[PDB]
Amino acid sequence: PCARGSQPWQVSLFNGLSFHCAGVLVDQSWVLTAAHCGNKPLWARVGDQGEQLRRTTRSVVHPKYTDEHDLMLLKLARPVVLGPRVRALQLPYRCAQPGDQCQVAGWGTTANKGLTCSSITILSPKECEVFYPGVVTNNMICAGLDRGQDPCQSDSGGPLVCDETLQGILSWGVYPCGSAQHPAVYTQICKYMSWINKVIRSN
> Does the active-site annotation cover 146?
no
Question: Are 179 and 117 contained in the same domain?
Answer: yes
Please indicate, yes or no, whether residues 1 and 53 belong to a single structural domain of this protein.
Answer: no
- In terms of residue numbers, what domain contains 116? 1-7+89-190
CATH number for the domain spanning 33: value is: 2.40.10.10
- Domain count within the chain: 2
Resolution (Å) of this entry:
2.7
The active-site residue, picked from 12, 27, 62, 70, is: 70
Asked whether residue 65 falls in the same domain as residue 145, the answer is no
Is position 36 annotated as part of the catalytic site?
yes
The CA distance from 144 to 139, in Å, is 17
What is the secondary structure of the chain as a DSSP string?
Answer: ---TT--TTEEEEEETTEEEEEEEEEETTEEEE-GGG-SS--EEEE----SEEEEEEEEEE-TT---SS--EEEEESSPPPPSSSS---PPPSSPPPTT-EEEEEE---------EEEEEEE--TTHHHHHSTT---TTEEEEEEPTT--GGGS-TT-EEEETTEEEEEEEE---SSS-SSSPEEEEEGGGSHHHHHHHTT--
Set 12, 20, 29, 36: catalytic member: 36
Q: Is 100 a catalytic residue?
A: no
* Burial (0-12, 13-18, 19+ Cβ within 10 Å), 164: exposed
Say which of 12, 118, 156, 171 is annotated catalytic: 156
